[PDB]
Design an enzyme around this catalytic site. Structure first.
Site, short mmCIF file in Angstrom:
data_model
loop_
_atom_site.label_atom_id
_atom_site.label_comp_id
_atom_site.label_asym_id
_atom_site.label_seq_id
_atom_site.Cartn_x
_atom_site.Cartn_y
_atom_site.Cartn_z
N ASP A 209 -0.75 6.63 19.92
CA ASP A 209 -1.68 6.35 18.83
C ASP A 209 -2.13 4.89 18.87
OD1 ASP A 209 -3.21 7.47 16.79
OD2 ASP A 209 -1.77 6.89 15.24
N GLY B 293 0.83 -1.18 0.00
CA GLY B 293 0.00 0.00 0.00
C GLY B 293 0.87 1.24 0.00
N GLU C 53 5.20 4.42 1.15
CA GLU C 53 4.77 3.13 0.63
C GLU C 53 5.33 2.03 1.52
OE1 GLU C 53 6.18 3.54 -3.64
OE2 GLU C 53 4.09 2.98 -3.95
C1 LIG Z 1 2.64 0.20 9.83
C2 LIG Z 1 3.42 -0.41 8.66
C3 LIG Z 1 4.50 0.54 8.06
N1 LIG Z 1 4.16 -1.56 9.21
N2 LIG Z 1 5.19 -1.46 10.11
C4 LIG Z 1 5.66 -2.70 10.41
C5 LIG Z 1 4.85 -3.62 9.66
C6 LIG Z 1 4.87 -5.07 9.60
N3 LIG Z 1 3.98 -5.70 8.80
C7 LIG Z 1 3.09 -5.06 8.09
N4 LIG Z 1 2.26 -5.95 7.35
C8 LIG Z 1 1.19 -5.58 6.48
C9 LIG Z 1 0.32 -6.60 6.03
C10 LIG Z 1 -0.71 -6.27 5.21
C11 LIG Z 1 -1.69 -7.35 4.70
C12 LIG Z 1 -1.78 -7.38 3.15
C13 LIG Z 1 -3.06 -7.89 2.89
N5 LIG Z 1 -3.92 -7.61 4.26
C14 LIG Z 1 -3.14 -6.98 5.17
N6 LIG Z 1 -0.87 -4.99 4.85
C15 LIG Z 1 -0.01 -4.07 5.29
N7 LIG Z 1 -0.18 -2.70 4.91
C16 LIG Z 1 -1.31 -2.23 3.84
C17 LIG Z 1 -1.35 -0.82 4.06
C18 LIG Z 1 0.20 -0.54 4.24
F1 LIG Z 1 0.41 0.61 4.89
F2 LIG Z 1 0.78 -0.63 3.01
C19 LIG Z 1 0.67 -1.73 5.16
N8 LIG Z 1 1.00 -4.31 6.09
C20 LIG Z 1 3.00 -3.66 8.10
C21 LIG Z 1 3.94 -2.92 8.94
#
Ligand SMILES: CC(C)n1ncc2cnc(Nc3cc([C@@H]4CCNC4)nc(N4CCC(F)(F)C4)n3)cc21
EC number: 2.7.11.1
Length: 290
Positions: free
Chosen positions: A135, A22, A28
């Site tokens: 948060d 995302g 990103e």
């Molecule tokens: C807060 C973020 C920077 N962060 N920090 C450490 C960390 C560890 N793991 C993830 N894992 C995931 C898994 C999924 C799964 C895909 C399909 N369903 C959820 N989506 C997302 N994000 C979709 C929207 C985004 F911001 F791009 C992230 N992150 C995110 C993490």
């Protein structure tokens, strides 16, 4: 300089980018794989060009790099390469609890109890370091494929820290300043117990799919919280939830911060000290998700 331990190298030297998960204002996020170990990581990528303000990202890295606790997302370093900053963290495959409940619907009381216990363990650790998350919410509580819980997204904490540092730098001469003015400038006007309140709201969010007053204008909500007769919110469905859950909400949502229980105290509450709270409860939730 963003951080004194940045890797000044291409992250693609160490990781294969597998999927863009995302993107938005924060930048990103990518799922990637360590080319040596095969372990999965999350990479948060943000623009970092000359004369950009580094202070917030600096503080976010400082928070992450000094945490070593199971319930805080693990930190694997940051890369600065061709004016992009990549923050490397433990991968949580299921995303946030918000990502999950938007598909599954409301969590069970036992699932919420386990989540709250794991978040409180992370909060107790942060608070013992004199850190404040600031948060806590479903969107910032991440779940890995094993059903384990990790606090993430320290962006708001870092923003506050950077603003606090800027206000020290330009506070001016202090000799005529009232002590409470100096205290707000140095410490912010509140303390770590704000995280306990936010966890109570999060428990309602997991139970009801929205925080209280979600449909009220944000400025009105802020105003109402400043009135002397402000009433903490409650769970809507009285019979759906045990007395222990209602009481957990009551005490986490203590209006006066002087009377609100600490994370360590909350870990003794019946709701989060009951037996049978383990990651299997969230594996059940992830099975429903699929
Ligand atoms: C807060 C973020 C920077 N962060 N920090 C450490 C960390 C560890 N793991 C993830 N894992 C995931 C898994 C999924 C799964 C895909 C399909 N369903 C959820 N989506 C997302 N994000 C979709 C929207 C985004 F911001 F791009 C992230 N992150 C995110 C993490």
């Amino acid at each position: 300089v963003v951080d004194p331990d940045i890797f000044n190298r291409d992250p693609r030297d160490h990781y294969d980018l597998l999927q863009r998960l995302g993107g938005g204002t924060y930048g990103e996020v990518f799922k990637a794989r360590d080319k040596v170990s095969g372990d999965l990581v999350a990479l948060k990528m943000v623009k970092m060009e000359p004369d950009d303000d580094v202070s917030t990202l600096q503080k976010e890295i400082l928070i992450l790099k000094t945490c070593r606790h199971a319930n805080i997302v693990a930190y694997h370093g940051s890369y600065l390469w061709l004016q992009k900053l990549w923050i490397c963290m433990e991968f949580c495959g299921a995303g946030s609890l918000q990502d999950i409940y938007q598909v599954t619907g409301s969590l069970s009381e036992l699932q919420i109890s386990y989540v709250c216990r794991e978040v409180l363990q992370g909060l107790a650790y942060l608070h013992s370091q004199k850190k404040i998350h600031r948060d806590i919410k479903g969107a910032n509580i991440l779940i890995n494929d094993a059903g384990e819980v990790r606090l993430a997204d320290f962006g708001i904490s870092a923003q506050i820290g950077a603003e606090l540092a800027r206000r020290l730098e330009f506070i001016g001469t202090p000799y005529w300043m009232a002590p409470e003015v100096a205290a707000v400038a140095l410490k912010g006007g509140y303390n770590e117990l704000c995280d306990i309140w936010s966890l109570g709201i999060t428990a309602i969010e997991l139970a009801e799919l929205q925080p209280p007053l979600f449909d009220v204008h944000p400025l009105r909500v802020l105003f109402l919280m400043t009135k002397s007769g402000y009433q903490p919110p409650r769970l809507k469905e009285k019979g759906k939830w045990s007395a222990a859950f209602h009481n957990f909400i009551k005490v986490t949502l203590t209006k006066s911060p002087k009377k609100r229980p600490s994370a360590t105290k909350m870990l003794s509450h019946q709701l989060v000290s009951q037996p049978g709270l383990n990651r299997g409860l969230i594996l059940d939730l992830l099975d429903k998700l699929k």
